[PDB]
Design a protein around this ligand. Structure first.
Ligand SMILES: CCc1ccc(-c2ccc3c(c2)-c2n[nH]cc2S(=O)(=O)N3C)cc1
Length: 262
């Protein structure tokens, strides 16, 4: 649990305004002053209850976990401050949360851009799958936008998500890479719906009955039939029948190229 080579001196951080929230408290914009960059914009996770040591241990665990990963489409850990008030310093995704990015840009994003985002996320997810990493805090799962052509996996924003969960997770709290694939199928649907949430107006308790009746989220307007088909494969009832992330990443590439050939 050593953070020594990524421990940041506090005076190198200028804490700015609140820009969002994580499981443990508010996320702030900031500036980090280092030899590498005189003024780097950062996101700073704070912790409302880290005066409690059990809470503090769980919070800094988020940093220890993030440290082990390095991927173009996963929000990077810059460093930590492990003295009170404890902070986790992360890269700042300047364009905010993908959901609201998509809602305001329904007509200014080409279909190729939407497919690229799905592809980029699949590369990150296949990377994690190869590392045997099952991300446990499913309620915290998010996607942030670092540029027009770059999205990243994150666990903060800028209850269980039943409407996004695989049937075996809902029924039996089984969580595997195959349940992650089901949830990513939903994420893809949301991207192609320009940020609309699944099962709007449906009670959480009614979700499993619809799945078990054979019902699935409908093809989004203007969505390529091949891409919708890919989503439906993520939603095989039997987890063993779903594609692996390696296959999703291969299929999304072929779809992306085809849209660019149109
Ligand atoms: C840094 C540790 C970490 C934090 C969050 C995730 C993360 C974020 C978003 C995700 C996911 C993970 C994710 N894994 N499987 C399915 C999904 S998802 O819900 O579609 N999705 C967008 C992965 C690793």
């Amino acid at each position: 649990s050593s953070t020594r080579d990524y421990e940041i001196q506090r005076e190198r951080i200028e804490l700015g305004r609140c820009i969002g929230e994580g499981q443990f408290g508010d996320v702030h914009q900031g500036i980090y002053m280092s030899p590498e960059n005189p003024a780097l914009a950062v996101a700073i996770k704070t912790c409302k209850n880290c005066t409690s040591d059990s809470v503090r241990e769980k919070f800094l665990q988020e940093a220890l976990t993030m440290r082990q990963f390095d991927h173009p489409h996963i929000v990077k850990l810059i460093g930590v401050i492990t003295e009170n008030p404890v902070w986790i310093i992360m890269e700042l995704c300047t364009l905010g949360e993908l959901r609201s990015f998509l809602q305001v840009r329904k007509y200014s994003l080409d279909l190729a851009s939407l497919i690229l985002y799905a592809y980029q996320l699949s590369t990150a997810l296949a990377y994690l799958e190869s590392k045997r990493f099952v991300h446990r805090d499913i309620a915290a799962r998010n996607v942030l936008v670092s540029s027009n052509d770059c999205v990243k996996l994150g666990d903060f924003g800028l209850k269980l998500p039943i409407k996004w969960m695989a049937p075996e997770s809902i029924n039996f709290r089984r969580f595997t890479s195959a349940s992650d694939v089901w949830m990513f199928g939903v994420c893809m649907w949301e991207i192609l719906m320009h940020g609309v949430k699944p099962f709007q107006g449906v009670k959480n308790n009614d979700v499993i009955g619809r799945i078990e009746n054979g019902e699935r989220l409908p093809m989004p307007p203007n969505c390529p039939p091949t891409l919708y088909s890919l989503m439906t494969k993520c939603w095989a009832y039997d987890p063993s029948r779903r594609p692996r992330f390696t296959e999703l990443k291969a299929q999304l590439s072929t779809i992306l190229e085809e849209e660019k050939a149109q």
